[PDB]
Amino acid sequence: EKYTIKETILTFNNEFNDPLDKYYKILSNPKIDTIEFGEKFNQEIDHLIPSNIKVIKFGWTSEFNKDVNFLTESLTEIYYGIYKNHSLEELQNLPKSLLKLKLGDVFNQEIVENVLPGGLTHLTFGEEFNQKIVENVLPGGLTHLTFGEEFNQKIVENVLPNSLTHLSFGDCFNQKITENVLPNSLTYLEFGRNFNQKITENVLPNSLTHLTFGWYFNQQITENVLPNSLTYLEFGRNFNQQITENVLPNSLTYLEFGRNFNQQITENVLPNSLTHITFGNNFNQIITENVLPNSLTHLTFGNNFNQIITENVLPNSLTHLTFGDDFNQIITENVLPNSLTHLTFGDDFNQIITENVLPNSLTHLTFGDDFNQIITENVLPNSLVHLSFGCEFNQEIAEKVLPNSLTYLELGHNFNQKIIENVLPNGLVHLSFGCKFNQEIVENVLPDSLTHLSFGHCFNQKITENVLPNSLTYLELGHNFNQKIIENVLPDRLTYLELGHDFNQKIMENVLPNSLTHLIFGTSFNQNLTENVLPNSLTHLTFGTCFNQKIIENVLPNSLTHLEFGPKFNQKITENVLPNSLTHLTFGTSFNQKITENVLPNGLTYLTFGLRFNQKITENVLPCSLTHLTFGWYFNQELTENVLPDTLKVLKIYYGNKDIILKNIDTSKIKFKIEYFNK
């Protein structure tokens, strides 16, 4: 039953439902233009909203259903939810200044002359609305009209305002749209699910730039139907009608087909102005020679497309080609254009790719699941910077195979071939081995450029001295990786280290480098940490599930700011073991140990206890700078005001214990905010 204020947007609780009689002062803040209400709020708001607010958003979930006849007369916007009806009295009484309105979902009465605000520009009907609209009903200056799920009434001439620019139908609308019905101002028209009528000549206006049909629309588009202003055409799921010559306008830049479209496309049907085609799922027709437009930059096939791509089929303008799930046709030499920079294959693609097949412009190559053919020397272009192999790829990679220019290499699940002296390019920045990779990585194989290196599930080989490159900043080790790290192996620029589930080997002194700031232990690590192990630059330490070793003086370094113990850590912590520098401490699920005076650094601002912490808090234990205290479910101890710090901003407690936790706290005069959580 509290409010959360943002820059201008006051949001209430989702179970708020308190009369607004005692909130006038809060809402009278002269820097708040809007109010958000949530689910359970059902209380009067007629005389309870000041002049400074310009938006009431109720969000679609609201249970608000009260008569509203007195908003402000200074509102410009209001949006209603699922349980709101109206009388037309109530519609006549929304304020003369209003610009943008969404009606309640329950509203399904017939609107007549001079009811909805004259000056209105944005109108949105609810779910249940399915009432007839006649000539001078909608405001004459309206620019945005949206119909909801159930509306299926007829629309006849001179009814839609000649100012209208965006008209979006809902699911049930399936009435004929005839000549001069749509305004000559309309730029967007979007049909919904059920709409399935012929569109003839002079029905779409010559100002229309966007047209989206929906699920069921499966009517033929003939010559001179679509306007020459049109840049955007998106068909929906069932449209499967053949599209012939002089039907698509010469200004069209975007075109997307839906699932069902599977018709042949001949010459002089795809306009030369097009830069983007996205094909449907089922599309599986032969694309012949001078069919595709010449200005095309992006081409995307569907999941069923699997037809041979022969010489000079793709334009020399094309830069992005994405294949679908089925595509599995041989690709020969002059098939892909010399402008093409991006290639993505799909799940099925598994044909050989020879010497001069891939163009010399190509920077990005993504293979599919199935792709598993040998890639030899001078196959991959010398312009390539990004290579992602998929799941089934497990072929050998020889010496001068991967181009000089390569920066990003992602190897797949099944990849488990050996990597020797000059396989990976000098210049490589990111390298990611997948699941199965478990071959030895010896010295002068990983390049001296590499900054990011990540290993997969299976990788559990030794990493010896001077294997890892000097310019490495980021190292992620995988599930099974459980080999000891020794004195001079981890490089001197490494800031980030993540150890894996299995990693449970002791760490000696001069191992973790003095550049390392971020350290992540995995599930199993449970080996004791002693003096000068952890680096004096380290800021972030995250322990995994099973780490339950006691910490002593001079172990956690005096730079450390974020510490997070894992589930099973439940060891006592005494004086000057937690560093001066600490600001965020997070106890894990099972930690249940007393805290005495002088233990948690005074500098500490965020403290979180996990599930099981249920020990008294005596005076002068909680840090003096603390701002966010979070307790766990099982914490059942009284708090007093003199044992909480003067700087506390937020206290998080379990709801079901509150009257036990705050038994000695007068909540009517706290200077902090109680956040609850529940079961």
Side-chain angles (χ1 to χ4, degrees):
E1 45 185 333
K2 274 174 227 70
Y3 61 92
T4 62
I5 286 167
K6 295 291 90 166
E7 74 293 348
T8 61
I9 297 167
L10 166 57
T11 313
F12 284 174
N13 192 286
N14 203 22
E15 296 70 20
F16 175 76
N17 201 4
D18 273 335
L20 287 201
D21 291 281
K22 79 159 306 162
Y23 290 73
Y24 200 102
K25 190 263 175 210
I26 299 159
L27 301 175
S28 292
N29 183 359
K31 76 163 72 195
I32 305 188
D33 60 341
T34 87
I35 306 160
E36 304 199 292
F37 289 83
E39 193 194 40
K40 284 282 179 195
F41 178 69
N42 203 8
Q43 301 293 326
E44 299 312 322
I45 73 188
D46 277 332
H47 309 267
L48 293 95
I49 301 305
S51 313
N52 54 10
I53 303 110
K54 314 283 182 272
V55 178
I56 302 167
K57 187 159 205 78
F58 269 96
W60 79 271
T61 200
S62 172
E63 301 184 19
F64 173 77
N65 188 4
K66 305 296 187 193
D67 319 322
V68 306
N69 282 269
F70 298 101
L71 270 313
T72 58
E73 309 283 36
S74 67
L75 261 191
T76 53
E77 314 179 2
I78 179 160
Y79 311 77
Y80 282 122
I82 203 70
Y83 271 119
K84 292 64 175 150
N85 213 332
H86 306 285
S87 72
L88 294 65
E89 196 111 329
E90 176 186 326
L91 293 173
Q92 297 222 27
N93 280 136
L94 290 120
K96 284 89 177 169
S97 69
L98 198 67
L99 275 254
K100 308 194 9 157
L101 176 54
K102 172 192 181 297
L103 282 81
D105 295 331
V106 190
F107 188 69
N108 193 28
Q109 274 189 30
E110 196 203 13
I111 321 205
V112 282
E113 202 89 337
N114 197 22
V115 180
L116 286 178
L120 200 70
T121 180
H122 292 66
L123 180 68
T124 321
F125 283 98
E127 197 213 301
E128 294 293 301
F129 190 72
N130 188 26
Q131 291 306 317
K132 301 217 182 34
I133 291 168
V134 300
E135 187 155 323
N136 306 330
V137 165
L138 305 169
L142 199 72
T143 65
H144 287 71
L145 175 62
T146 309
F147 284 115
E149 282 194 7
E150 281 305 300
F151 185 74
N152 197 22
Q153 296 295 317
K154 303 194 192 141
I155 307 286
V156 275
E157 179 187 324
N158 300 136
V159 73
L160 288 183
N162 53 76
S163 61
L164 194 71
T165 67
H166 296 61
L167 168 68
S168 183
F169 287 110
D171 304 322
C172 281
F173 186 74
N174 181 40
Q175 292 300 323
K176 280 159 46 87
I177 298 285
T178 38
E179 179 168 291
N180 295 103
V181 172
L182 291 180
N184 272 334
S185 52
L186 197 69
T187 66
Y188 291 64
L189 170 65
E190 192 208 326
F191 296 96
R193 144 182 287 271
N194 282 124
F195 182 66
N196 196 14
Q197 261 69 218
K198 287 64 61 213
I199 314 296
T200 67
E201 293 189 5
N202 278 292
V203 304
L204 303 177
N206 268 119
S207 50
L208 198 64
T209 71
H210 296 73
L211 176 66
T212 310
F213 301 108
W215 192 281
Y216 279 108
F217 177 84
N218 200 9
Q219 301 299 319
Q220 212 165 26
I221 317 290
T222 55
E223 278 193 62
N224 304 136
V225 172
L226 307 165
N228 285 106
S229 49
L230 196 73
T231 69
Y232 183 114
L233 179 58
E234 178 170 358
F235 287 107
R237 168 209 165 100
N238 292 342
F239 179 80
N240 190 17
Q241 302 291 313
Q242 163 225 319
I243 293 174
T244 127
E245 301 175 44
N246 306 1
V247 318
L248 282 140
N250 291 325
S251 52
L252 199 69
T253 57
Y254 183 104
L255 168 62
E256 170 164 2
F257 288 113
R259 163 190 203 273
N260 279 38
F261 181 83
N262 192 17
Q263 297 296 325
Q264 260 174 75
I265 297 135
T266 71
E267 186 198 356
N268 303 306
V269 324
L270 288 178
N272 270 340
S273 56
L274 271 180
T275 73
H276 293 60
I277 317 259
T278 299
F279 275 111
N281 212 62
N282 293 3
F283 182 72
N284 202 14
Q285 300 287 322
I286 303 278
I287 310 285
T288 63
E289 251 221 39
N290 298 129
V291 174
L292 293 166
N294 53 263
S295 56
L296 198 60
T297 69
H298 297 58
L299 182 55
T300 314
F301 285 114
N303 284 335
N304 288 118
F305 180 70
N306 199 13
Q307 308 284 289
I308 187 108
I309 306 296
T310 62
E311 184 144 339
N312 301 132
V313 167
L314 280 57
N316 263 300
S317 57
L318 191 63
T319 64
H320 292 65
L321 177 62
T322 299
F323 284 110
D325 274 336
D326 275 4
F327 182 77
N328 188 32
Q329 299 294 314
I330 293 67
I331 293 192
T332 70
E333 289 203 289
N334 301 122
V335 170
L336 310 166
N338 270 327
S339 54
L340 195 64
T341 60
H342 299 67
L343 192 58
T344 296
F345 285 110
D347 281 334
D348 269 7
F349 180 65
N350 192 21
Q351 291 313 319
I352 299 69
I353 288 198
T354 87
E355 271 221 300
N356 293 131
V357 171
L358 298 173
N360 278 121
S361 52
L362 196 76
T363 56
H364 298 68
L365 183 54
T366 290
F367 282 103
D369 268 341
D370 288 356
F371 177 73
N372 198 15
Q373 300 299 343
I374 52 143
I375 283 181
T376 84
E377 180 180 358
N378 301 129
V379 160
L380 288 185
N382 263 344
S383 56
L384 206 80
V385 298
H386 186 271
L387 179 59
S388 297
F389 285 104
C391 178
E392 293 218 55
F393 185 69
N394 185 29
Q395 298 298 345
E396 290 214 285
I397 309 196
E399 280 210 313
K400 268 150 66 90
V401 243
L402 297 167
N404 283 120
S405 52
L406 195 73
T407 60
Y408 178 93
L409 163 72
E410 177 193 309
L411 291 158
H413 183 255
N414 295 342
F415 190 80
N416 192 16
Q417 304 292 334
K418 323 192 157 305
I419 301 221
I420 67 171
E421 289 290 345
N422 291 108
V423 179
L424 299 160
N426 283 340
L428 195 73
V429 193
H430 297 261
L431 173 55
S432 144
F433 293 100
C435 165
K436 295 300 291 139
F437 180 79
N438 202 7
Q439 307 285 343
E440 283 185 291
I441 297 191
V442 299
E443 58 182 15
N444 296 120
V445 317
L446 294 173
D448 273 316
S449 61
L450 198 61
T451 55
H452 287 58
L453 174 66
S454 79
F455 285 99
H457 200 94
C458 293
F459 180 66
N460 189 7
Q461 308 287 328
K462 296 164 129 41
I463 308 174
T464 58
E465 298 197 343
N466 189 222
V467 171
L468 273 51
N470 54 310
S471 65
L472 201 69
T473 64
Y474 173 103
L475 183 69
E476 179 184 340
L477 289 167
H479 193 276
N480 290 3
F481 182 75
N482 196 3
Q483 304 294 318
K484 314 143 232 201
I485 294 82
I486 293 320
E487 190 124 75
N488 292 303
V489 53
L490 302 168
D492 281 330
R493 270 172 173 262
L494 180 70
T495 74
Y496 178 99
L497 184 63
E498 186 162 5
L499 292 162
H501 179 277
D502 290 10
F503 187 76
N504 196 8
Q505 311 287 315
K506 280 164 280 171
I507 313 284
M508 289 190 72
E509 285 208 11
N510 282 280
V511 169
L512 301 179
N514 279 126
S515 62
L516 187 76
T517 62
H518 282 72
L519 185 55
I520 311 303
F521 286 97
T523 297
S524 297
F525 182 77
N526 198 10
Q527 310 290 304
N528 183 34
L529 294 183
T530 74
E531 292 85 334
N532 284 95
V533 173
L534 296 173
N536 60 13
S537 54
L538 186 70
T539 63
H540 285 64
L541 187 63
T542 315
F543 283 107
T545 304
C546 298
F547 178 74
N548 192 10
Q549 302 304 282
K550 185 186 296 265
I551 311 301
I552 76 180
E553 284 225 15
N554 297 309
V555 173
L556 305 168
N558 260 95
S559 44
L560 191 76
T561 172
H562 299 56
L563 181 59
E564 177 166 356
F565 289 108
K568 295 218 170 215
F569 179 76
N570 186 15
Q571 301 292 311
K572 270 97 167 136
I573 292 192
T574 74
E575 281 79 334
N576 290 111
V577 56
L578 293 179
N580 278 49
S581 55
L582 201 67
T583 70
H584 295 56
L585 178 69
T586 313
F587 285 104
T589 71
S590 76
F591 176 80
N592 202 359
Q593 297 300 331
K594 285 193 208 138
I595 291 167
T596 53
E597 289 82 345
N598 208 347
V599 176
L600 304 167
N602 262 346
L604 196 76
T605 51
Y606 288 70
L607 184 58
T608 311
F609 289 96
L611 197 77
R612 287 203 160 289
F613 178 83
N614 187 7
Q615 313 287 305
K616 280 72 164 179
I617 310 295
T618 173
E619 292 186 349
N620 296 182
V621 295
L622 281 191
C624 271
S625 283
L626 187 132
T627 68
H628 294 73
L629 177 62
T630 307
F631 281 156
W633 196 355
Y634 293 145
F635 183 81
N636 226 339
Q637 303 290 335
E638 290 167 358
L639 294 178
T640 78
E641 277 107 289
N642 35 36
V643 78
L644 292 173
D646 272 6
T647 64
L648 179 60
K649 296 192 289 156
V650 163
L651 177 52
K652 186 149 134 218
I653 305 302
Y654 171 59
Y655 192 76
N657 295 320
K658 65 193 184 58
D659 300 340
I660 309 105
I661 305 306
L662 312 149
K663 188 193 159 206
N664 284 200
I665 286 168
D666 189 357
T667 77
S668 73
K669 321 293 244 171
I670 62 195
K671 228 86 147 92
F672 52 63
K673 311 228 139 171
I674 58 215
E675 208 167 326
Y676 302 119
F677 70 89
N678 71 47
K679 38 69 215 208

